[PDB]
A paper describes a structure:
Despite the lower resolution, the cryo-EM density of MyxB-SRC was well-resolved and suggested an analogous mode of interaction with the ribosome as MyxA, consistent with the high conservation in their chemical structures. Collectively, our toeprinting results are consistent with the previous finding that MyxB does not prevent binding of the fMet-tRNA at the P-site but rather interferes with binding of aminoacyl-tRNAs to the A-site. Indeed, in the MyxB-SRC, we observed the simultaneous presence of P-site tRNA and MyxB but no ribosomes with additional presence of A-site tRNA. However, careful examination of the MyxB-SRC revealed that while the acceptor arm of the P-site tRNA has accommodated on the large subunit, the terminal CCA-end is not fully accommodated at the PTC. Instead, the P-site tRNA is shifted by 1.5 Å when compared to a fully accommodated pre-attack state P-site tRNA and accommodation appears to be prevented due to direct steric clashes with MyxB, specifically, between the fMet moiety of the initiator tRNA and the IB and D-Val4 of MyxB. Indeed, the density for the P-site tRNA in the MyxB-SRC is consistent with an initiator fMet-tRNA; however, the CCA-end of the P-site tRNA is flexible, and thus, there is little to no density observed for the fMet moiety. Even if the fMet-tRNA were able to fully accommodate at the P-site, the IB and D-Val1 moieties of MyxB encroach on the A-site and would prevent accommodation of most, if not all, aminoacyl-tRNAs at the PTC. We note here that the only difference between MyxA and MyxB is the addition of two methyl groups on the IB moiety of MyxA, which we would predict occlude the A-site even further. Our toeprinting assays and structure of the MyxB-SRC lead us to propose a model for the mechanism of action of myxovalargins, namely, that they trap ribosomes during a late stage of translation initiation by preventing full accommodation of the initiator tRNA at the peptidyl-transferase center on the large ribosomal subunit.
Numbering used by the authors:
A (entry chain k): 1 to 46
B (entry chain K): 2 to 272
C (entry chain b): 1 to 93
The structure:
RNA sequence: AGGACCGAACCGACUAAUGUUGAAAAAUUAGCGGAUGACUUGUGGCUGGGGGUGAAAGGCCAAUCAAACCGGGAGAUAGCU
RNA sequence: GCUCGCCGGAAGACCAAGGGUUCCUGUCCAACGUUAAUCGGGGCAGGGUGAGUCGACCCCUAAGGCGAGGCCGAAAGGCGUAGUCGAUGGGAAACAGGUUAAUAUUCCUGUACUUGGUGUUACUGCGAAGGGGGGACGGAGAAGGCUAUGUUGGCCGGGCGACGGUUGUCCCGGUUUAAGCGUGUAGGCUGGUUUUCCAGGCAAAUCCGGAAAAUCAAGGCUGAGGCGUGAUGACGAGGCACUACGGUGCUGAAGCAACAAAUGCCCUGCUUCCAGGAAAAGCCUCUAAGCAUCAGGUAACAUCAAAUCGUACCCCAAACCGACACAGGUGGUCAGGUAGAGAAUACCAAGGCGCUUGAGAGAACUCGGGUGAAGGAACUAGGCAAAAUGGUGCCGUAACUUCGGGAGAAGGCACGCUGAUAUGUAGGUGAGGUCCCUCGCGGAUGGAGCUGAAAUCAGUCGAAGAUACCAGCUGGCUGCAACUGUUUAUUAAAAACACAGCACUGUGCAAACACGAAAGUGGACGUAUACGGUGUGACGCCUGCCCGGUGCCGGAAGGUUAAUU
């Protein structure tokens, strides 16, 4: 039974990484909210 | 050329392969070869804008000279090549200056035949002249709609346009569709018809053959659900509606041309 | 070339184990803990100037820090760098 | 030669039993179908919610689908319990 | 430690992905481990990953992404040019042995190689962002030449048997060696060479393309493998001293040939087919500006540089994805023996395991199997399940048919072993020798040796010879769908969907149409033998009647009729 999560570091960073977040206004709002909440890990970045 | 295949298996019983042995069996001319990446009928937004387009065989686009602008220099047909991008067969021609160009091969322009373009060119199949210099009634192909723009009419296979009349600046042309269009006499047109007129006599014979050409299966609208197509579906095979497109527009009879910018050129519409 | 300031910082400390001693006695290789940013050319110059030994080749490996624990919280040791410096024939400590 | 034939890998999933607080939130076992093709597969890419994609089942779109998920309007409104 | 059993196209061995110290050592057993635990992928501590040549980075581009300006859009944005990123693809170079508890193409030993840089000398037309070539490419198929590899012999070392026999025609083991460099062979492609001359390759060009002569055709390119060297070496069965009893040192024989043989190599080949099969750089070459002492270039030579990052360990799994040490999922690489067509299957090798609760008993019942008197579908919704068929050769095979089929129809006979034919044949492989020879990776002949079906005849054993595993049940009539395909991931694989074919209809290109406040993009670098939509659904015979209604197409007199006035 193949499951939904298939780990791939390259794809993970290209979709949920820091640079992908900073590339769009919406993605920067994500980082701002996470910074406002106080998330230690702001992104899946490495 | 039309050759039926013996029924040695289901999928070969109905295949009617048109075989032309004059076609160069080697690789095509490399210097006039570019890349033809497939799109899957999708636009720059990634959305399927044209349905039933996907897969197929890889094709390298052969650059065909539809303008035929090298006037004065004769060319010699070297090989009648095969073009995977068009219904017709291209033809590599060598000019007397050492330049090779691909042209849509006319009906019987075999290797060795000499072709020439320009106003000084002779009235022969494969020679390109402006329609002002071509006699009225002469069958032509690769007709330009604008002078110097390149041919864009009767370029399929076995297609040609008869010059109905000449009325000074413009010339009446009977297109394959049956429409009479006025095109400027300055526009160039190649004498003769397009070759490979046996193209219509081929029979794919099987669903694989359609997929080889990059055509995906067409689902009928009546086989879908009301949310998927206007035809939707009922209990059983239910229709009871005027045939419409997947977007609601009437399909059987409704006209859709809406230009008003090109109507003047049109003399008679295809009956 | 490489300033003596740089050469006086690239070498952190001698490395003491069991493999290091075997190498120091058989392959004439002194294993030395070096700066993370110390390149092989930097390590060579430093060894020859602060130990007065002619060096042949320097092999560098980055040793990842083992993630230990304090009994209640997970902490990670910092990555260090190990340098296998092969002395041509010079003798040392 | 072949969307040819038999048949492992491989890709599927017709039947039976088992299992149904499972070994498993879809499997196991014995059989079964395709197996040079409209095949299958690795990596990356692309299409986004009345939107997509669909050889079309309202299928699929992260164990979620006659309108995903998350947050918000929000303490929606419940002559009902 | 000895038996035993299991896997062996795996349950072995390498990786990539992912994980992240799980690696190895010492130590501890509370918890974790479905039981105990002294043990562990657990706790704790310490140690372990060494590279110019492997990978990344790097140079180069694909799909695609972002995108100066730009175009467009209430805004946020969208698209896209010049560009610039982006591998799953292209681009320089290392192999054999040895070694640690834990890394090794990385350390060591031996022998190599690459690309830059600087310098010397000789010599010289050098020079892009341009031009050309090249890189550079499909499916299938059919060979032949080969190697990996196996087998056999020979050779060398050892052996002489717990129970009848076994100094031999016996038994066991070994019999291995690379990159590189040198040669240039089976095979593949190609005429060659010189000269003159021009609308082309934006300009230019000695390059490419073309055109024309001249003369010669044997030169070029490419290419497995082999042989030579590397290699006086390494490794090596196995011995001998000492033993932290694990070892440790040290020494070390043969190291050949024959045959068989890949799915690997020659082969990016070759033949054929239609569905017509990346790009870019490295690379080779050509010129455009200066300058012609320079600088650049070229060849040899000397010296210098090749950084950084990864390298443990798992990786079909107890380490990844599945909450679990979960009967699941997970791409690539290698591919031994016997039997076999085989990567099936059976049994083994190398290697790895016995699945982290056991001990008893031997009730019903459940599960998974074996057998069954007589009967033989009577069972049941239904032969569900089970049983049966099952290999090869050969004989033989109906209706119907689209002439392919049906068909493996149906049905039936032979099959083990042994001997002879023929102390192993036909076939294949081929040494020596002999001659030729432009004296070689050469040719002719010839056959040693090696391997080796099938068949026939005769005999012989069993109840049975395709003896296990493995391995169609068959026939008859009819519905639906032509067919291979596709689908409700996880109750529906079907008559549903698709399908070739057919038809109607739209559409003249700035096409219809589709996604887009738009720009723009697909359609399509297509052009009516085209594309879109719709219906039907191979093929054969065909497809009647109705336009009153609804829709569509056409026509507009006239009636009606908006904004406006
Ligand atoms: Mg319906
Ligand atoms: Mg129904
Ligand atoms: Mg009905
Ligand atoms: Mg229905
Ligand atoms: Mg810890
Ligand atoms: Mg079958
Ligand atoms: Mg199964
Ligand atoms: Mg079977
Ligand atoms: Mg993907
Ligand atoms: Mg919605
Ligand atoms: Mg919500
Ligand atoms: Mg409430
Ligand atoms: Mg331990
Ligand atoms: Mg780049
Ligand atoms: Mg073929
Ligand atoms: Mg005896
Ligand atoms: Mg020999
Ligand atoms: Mg193969
Ligand atoms: Mg390094
Ligand atoms: Mg590992
Ligand atoms: Mg387990
Ligand atoms: Mg598991
Ligand atoms: Mg399994
Ligand atoms: Mg097996
Ligand atoms: Mg067990
Ligand atoms: Mg019975
Ligand atoms: Mg049966
Ligand atoms: Mg019917
Ligand atoms: Mg069917
Ligand atoms: Mg289903
Ligand atoms: Mg099912
Ligand atoms: Mg139908
Ligand atoms: Mg039907
Ligand atoms: Mg009628």
């Amino acid at each position: 039974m193949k499951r939904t999560f298939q780990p791939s570091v390259l794809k993970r960073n290209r979709s949920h990484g820091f640079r992908a977040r900073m590339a769009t206004k919406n993605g920067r709002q994500v980082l701002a909210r996470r910074r406002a909440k106080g998330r230690a890990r702001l992104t899946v970045s490495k | 050329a039309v050759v039926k295949c013996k029924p040695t298996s289901p999928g070969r019983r109905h295949v009617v392969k048109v075989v032309n042995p004059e076609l160069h069996k080697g690789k095509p001319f490399a210097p006039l070869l570019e890349k033809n990446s497939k799109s899957g009928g999708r636009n720059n937004n990634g959305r399927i804008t044209t349905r039933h387009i996907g897969g197929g065989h890889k094709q390298a686009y052969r650059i065909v000279d539809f303008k035929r602008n090298k006037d004065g220099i004769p060319a010699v047909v070297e090989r009648l090549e095969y073009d995977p991008n068009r219904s017709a067969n291209i033809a590599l021609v060598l000019y007397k200056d050492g330049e090779r160009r691909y042209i849509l091969a006319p009906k019987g322009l075999k290797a060795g035949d000499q072709i020439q373009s320009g106003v000084d060119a002779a009235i022969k199949p494969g020679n390109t002249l402006p329609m002002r210099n071509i006699p009225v009634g002469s069958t032509v192909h690769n007709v330009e709609m604008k002078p110097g723009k390149g041919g864009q009419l009767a370029r399929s296979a076995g297609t040609y346009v008869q010059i109905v009349a000449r009325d000074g600046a413009y010339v009446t042309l009977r297109l394959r569709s049956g429409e009479m269009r006025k095109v400027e006499a300055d526009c160039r047109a190649t004498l003769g018809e397009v070759g490979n007129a046996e193209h219509m006599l081929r029979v794919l014979g099987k669903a694989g053959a359609a997929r080889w050409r990059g055509v995906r299966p067409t689902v009928r609208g009546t086989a879908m659900n009301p949310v998927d197509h206007p035809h939707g579906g009922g209990e059983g095979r239910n229709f009871g509606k005027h045939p419409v497109t997947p977007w609601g527009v009437q399909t059987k009879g409704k006209k859709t041309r809406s230009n008003k910018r090109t109507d003047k050129f049109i003399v008679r519409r295809r009956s | 070339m490489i300033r003596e300031e740089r050469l006086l910082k690239v070498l952190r400390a001698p490395h003491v184990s069991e493999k290091a001693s075997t190498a120091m006695e058989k392959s004439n290789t002194i294993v030395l803990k070096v700066a993370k940013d110390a390149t092989k050319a930097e390590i060579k110059a430093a060894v020859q100037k602060l130990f007065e030994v002619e060096v042949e080749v320097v092999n560098t490996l980055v040793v990842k820090g083992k993630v230990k624990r304090h009994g209640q919280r997970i902490g990670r040791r910092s990555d260090w760098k190990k340098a296998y410096v092969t002395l041509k024939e010079g003798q040392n400590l």
